[PDB]
Each structure stands twice: as C-alpha cells, then as structure tokens.
Design an enzyme around this catalytic site. Structure first.
Site, PDB file in Angstrom:
ATOM      1  N   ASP A 169       6.056  -2.163  -5.586  1.00 63.44           N
ATOM      2  CA  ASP A 169       6.133  -0.714  -4.759  1.00 63.44           C
ATOM      3  C   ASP A 169       6.522   0.158  -5.772  1.00 63.44           C
ATOM      4  O   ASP A 169       6.796   1.442  -5.247  1.00 63.44           O
ATOM      5  CB  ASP A 169       7.658  -0.947  -3.987  1.00 63.44           C
ATOM      6  CG  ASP A 169       8.923  -1.179  -4.767  1.00 63.44           C
ATOM      7  OD1 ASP A 169       8.899  -1.147  -6.131  1.00 63.44           O
ATOM      8  OD2 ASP A 169      10.016  -1.257  -4.215  1.00 63.44           O
TER       9      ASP A 169
ATOM     10  N   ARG B  34       7.284   5.890  -6.393  1.00 62.39           N
ATOM     11  CA  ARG B  34       7.649   4.800  -5.243  1.00 62.39           C
ATOM     12  C   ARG B  34       6.789   4.825  -4.105  1.00 62.39           C
ATOM     13  O   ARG B  34       6.471   5.904  -3.703  1.00 62.39           O
ATOM     14  CB  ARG B  34       9.308   5.166  -4.969  1.00 62.39           C
ATOM     15  CG  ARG B  34       9.668   4.307  -3.729  1.00 62.39           C
ATOM     16  CD  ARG B  34       9.934   2.774  -4.083  1.00 62.39           C
ATOM     17  NE  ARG B  34      10.562   2.057  -2.803  1.00 62.39           N
ATOM     18  CZ  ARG B  34      10.083   1.450  -1.787  1.00 62.39           C
ATOM     19  NH1 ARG B  34       8.674   1.565  -1.584  1.00 62.39           N
ATOM     20  NH2 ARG B  34      10.870   0.706  -0.940  1.00 62.39           N
TER      21      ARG B  34
ATOM     22  N   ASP C  16       8.328  -1.464   1.986  1.00 65.22           N
ATOM     23  CA  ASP C  16       9.069  -2.320   1.481  1.00 65.22           C
ATOM     24  C   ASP C  16       8.348  -3.728   1.239  1.00 65.22           C
ATOM     25  O   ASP C  16       7.978  -4.391   1.900  1.00 65.22           O
ATOM     26  CB  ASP C  16      10.156  -2.775   2.195  1.00 65.22           C
ATOM     27  CG  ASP C  16      11.099  -1.640   2.613  1.00 65.22           C
ATOM     28  OD1 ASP C  16      11.681  -0.805   1.617  1.00 65.22           O
ATOM     29  OD2 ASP C  16      11.274  -1.289   3.949  1.00 65.22           O
ATOM     30  N   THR C  17       7.913  -3.866  -0.142  1.00 64.54           N
ATOM     31  CA  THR C  17       7.545  -5.051  -0.712  1.00 64.54           C
ATOM     32  C   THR C  17       8.852  -5.992  -1.473  1.00 64.54           C
ATOM     33  O   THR C  17       9.795  -5.525  -1.551  1.00 64.54           O
ATOM     34  CB  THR C  17       6.659  -5.234  -2.056  1.00 64.54           C
ATOM     35  OG1 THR C  17       7.313  -4.450  -3.127  1.00 64.54           O
ATOM     36  CG2 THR C  17       5.551  -4.022  -1.518  1.00 64.54           C
TER      37      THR C  17
ATOM     38  N   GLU D  56      10.669  -7.828  -3.924  1.00 67.08           N
ATOM     39  CA  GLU D  56      10.646  -7.251  -5.446  1.00 67.08           C
ATOM     40  C   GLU D  56      10.756  -8.320  -6.398  1.00 67.08           C
ATOM     41  O   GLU D  56      11.395  -9.575  -6.156  1.00 67.08           O
ATOM     42  CB  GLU D  56      11.824  -6.130  -5.619  1.00 67.08           C
ATOM     43  CG  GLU D  56      11.463  -4.957  -4.699  1.00 67.08           C
ATOM     44  CD  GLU D  56      12.869  -4.200  -4.590  1.00 67.08           C
ATOM     45  OE1 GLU D  56      13.223  -3.547  -5.719  1.00 67.08           O
ATOM     46  OE2 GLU D  56      13.365  -4.003  -3.313  1.00 67.08           O
TER      47      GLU D  56
ATOM     48  N   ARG E  19      12.355   9.446  -8.522  1.00 64.61           N
ATOM     49  CA  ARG E  19      11.054   8.791  -8.155  1.00 64.61           C
ATOM     50  C   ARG E  19      10.225   9.699  -7.483  1.00 64.61           C
ATOM     51  O   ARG E  19      10.603   9.873  -6.227  1.00 64.61           O
ATOM     52  CB  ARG E  19      10.966   7.471  -7.875  1.00 64.61           C
ATOM     53  CG  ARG E  19      11.656   6.505  -8.673  1.00 64.61           C
ATOM     54  CD  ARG E  19      11.772   4.912  -8.130  1.00 64.61           C
ATOM     55  NE  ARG E  19      12.446   4.874  -6.941  1.00 64.61           N
ATOM     56  CZ  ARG E  19      12.529   3.620  -6.283  1.00 64.61           C
ATOM     57  NH1 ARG E  19      12.110   2.469  -6.811  1.00 64.61           N
ATOM     58  NH2 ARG E  19      13.226   3.541  -5.261  1.00 64.61           N
TER      59      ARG E  19
END
Length: 136
Positions: free
Chosen positions: A16, A30, A35-36, A38, A82
């Site tokens: 991500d 970001r 949402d991946t 992680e 980010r």
C-alpha cells in the site's frame, strides 16, 4: 477536475506504500482507498497475502514506463506525512488493480477523498464473486 502528474519511482515499500520522486522531492505515498495485507504491520508484522500484495505493487510500478499520481479533492497528505493519491502505472490504476485481483479491500472512506470509490467497490465485488486471493 482531478489531473494526473508525472512521478519517478524510487522504491516500492509495501503493498500500500511506494516512495516516489514528485516535483523533484522524494516522498512516500500511501495508496488512496485501499487496505492491503501488510508486510510491515505495526502490530502483526507480515499478514497473510501481504508478501503477495507487496510483490504485485512492486512489479507493477517497477516495470512501468510511466508513473503518474492523481490527488483527490480533499487532504493530500496524512498524519505521517505520506502523500494520499491514486497511482497509475502506464495508464492503469495500481489501487484498482490490487482490488480487482483480490489483494486489497476498499478502505473506510473519508470524504471528500472518495472520487473513485464506486469504481473500486465495483472491482471489489467482482474479485469477491471470482473468489480471488483474500476472498478465496
């Protein structure tokens, strides 16, 4: 009125997060709205499908001829500094590709940063129907 701007890859960091040179400054980005799993989870470390999500993002940005970033209409950075953006690899949105492949879920959305929400949700529904990866 969203517009794409050029950027140069510096390093993929995670599923991500990618580090890019933007307007001549290195910056961490970001990916908006996803949402991946992680590899660098603050509490869990490396989750299931995290290496896979991470490898997918990496290959897609490392192999592109052109990277572009597209900011949304709200806040352009988060509390960690980010950049918040949609990232394109040769015209293909990395955020959507992850979701279409079952390697990310659509995130909790915060308006007005929600321009591509419907589109992503459409791809997520498809990945769920095909029972891909996270949905398998």
């Amino acid at each position: 009125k969203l517009h794409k701007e050029p950027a140069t890859l510096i390093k993929a960091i995670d599923g991500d997060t990618v580090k890019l040179m933007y307007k001549g400054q290195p910056m961490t980005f970001r990916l908006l709205l996803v949402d991946t799993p992680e590899t660098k989870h603050p509490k869990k470390g490396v989750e299931k499908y995290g290496p896979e999500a991470s490898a997918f993002t990496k290959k897609m940005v490392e192999n592109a001829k052109k990277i572009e970033v597209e900011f949304d209409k709200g806040q352009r950075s988060d509390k960690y500094g980010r950049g918040l953006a949609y990232i394109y690899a040769d015209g293909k949105m990395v955020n959507e590709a992850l979701v279409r492949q079952g390697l990310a879920k659509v995130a909790y959305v915060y308006k007005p940063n929600n321009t591509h929400e419907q589109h992503l949700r459409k791809s997520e529904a498809q990945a769920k129907k095909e029972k891909l990866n996270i949905w398998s």
